Design a protein around this nucleic acid. Structure first.
Ligand SMILES: [Ca+2]
Ligand SMILES: [Zn+2]
Ligand SMILES: [Zn+2]
Length: 59
DNA sequence: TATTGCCGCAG
DNA sequence: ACTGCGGCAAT
């Protein structure tokens, strides 16, 4: 139940370093991976990949 | 100590 | 529909 990782600007706590890494980068606006179709930026390639289905033609 | 893929939760 | 989020496992 321990959440020993925390943000130095707002104090939000995390179970492990990954949640903190992502949270810090979200404060920074660090979104280095982009959708090749529309240019929208995301934190990582997994998030880009999940976004791609926006560009399918809807049923 | 670090980063992301996968995954589920929630709005 | 779309995506912000974050725990876990792996690296
Ligand atoms: Ca969760
Ligand atoms: Zn914070
Ligand atoms: Zn796109």
């Amino acid at each position: 139940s321990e959440r020993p990782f925390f943000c130095n600007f707002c104090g939000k706590t995390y179970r492990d370093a990954s949640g903190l890494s992502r949270h810090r980068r979200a404060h920074l606006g660090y979104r280095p991976r982009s959708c090749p179709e529309c240019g929208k930026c995301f934190r990582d390639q997994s998030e880009v990949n999940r976004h791609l289905k926006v560009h399918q033609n809807k049923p």
